[PDB]
Every structure is written in C-alpha cells, then in structure tokens.
Amino acid sequence: ETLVRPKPELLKLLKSVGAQKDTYTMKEVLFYLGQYIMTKRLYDEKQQHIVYCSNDLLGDLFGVPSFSVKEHRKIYTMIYRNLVV
Numbered sequence: 035e036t037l038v039r040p041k042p043e044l045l046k047l048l049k050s051v052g053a054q055k056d057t058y059t060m061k062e063v064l065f066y067l068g069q070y071i072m073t074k075r076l077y078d079e080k081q082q083h084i085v086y087c088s089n090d091l092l093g094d095l096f097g098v099p100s101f102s103v104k105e106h107r108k109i110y111t112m113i114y115r116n117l118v119v
C-alpha cells in the first residue's frame with residue numbers, strides 16, 4: 035500500500051540484499067530486513083527472538099545493540115527514523 039522512502043544508508047542496506055527501488059512498502063522493507071538478518075546471522079541460536087546488530091550497519095541505523103522481533107511497534111519506530119519525505 036503506502037510507500038516509504040529510505041534514507042541513503044538504509045537504502046544501501048536494502049540494496050545489499052537485492053533491493054532495486056527508491057520507495058517501498060513497509061512489508062517490503064521488513065522482507066529485506068529479514069533477509070539481511072538471516073544472511074548475516076544477526077542472532078544467536080539460543081535466543082531466537084533477539085536480533086543482535088551491535089557493530090553492524092543495522093545497529094548503527096537502528097541506534098541499538100539488539101532488539102526483540104516480538105516488539106513490532108519499536109521495529110517500525112527504528113525504520114521510521116531512517117525514512118525521508
């Protein structure tokens with residue numbers, strides 16, 4: 035539905051997992067974010083609800099060393115701090 039426009043650095047991250055537009059639905063952003071987390075192993079097998087993104091571009095952009103996958107609104111907050119008109 036509605037389109038969001040990533041800042042350059044987030045756009046960089048999305049493109050590193052094969053994205054090729056300037057604008058995306060939130061659903062597409064989360065798809066690519068998932069791909070990025072899985073292909074970079076940004077988690078620990080013993081804690082499957084936590085993304086560990088400290089010392090990764092993703093942590094720089096989201097401004098946190100880890101976050102919970104069950105905390106959806108905060109995930110949207112962090113994405114929105116990386117969005118532009």
Ligand SMILES: CC[C@@H]1CC[C@@H](C(=O)N2CCN(C(C)=O)[C@H](C)C2)N1C(=O)C1=C(C(C)C)N2C(=N[C@@](C)(c3ccc(Cl)cc3)[C@H]2c2ccc(Cl)cc2)S1
Nearest residue numbers: 064067068069071072077079082083084085103104106109
């Ligand atoms: C944080 C990633 C977690 C840890 C392990 C792995 C997982 O369950 N498995 C399944 C079990 N397994 C094996 C080897 O059998 C592996 C450990 C892989 N895993 C995931 O697959 C998850 C995924 C992958 C598709 C990325 N997601 C999850 N919530 C998902 C469904 C999700 C959560 C929140 C929101 Cl808003 C949207 C989607 C998705 C995801 C997507 C984007 C972001 Cl930023 C965070 C999470 S939980």
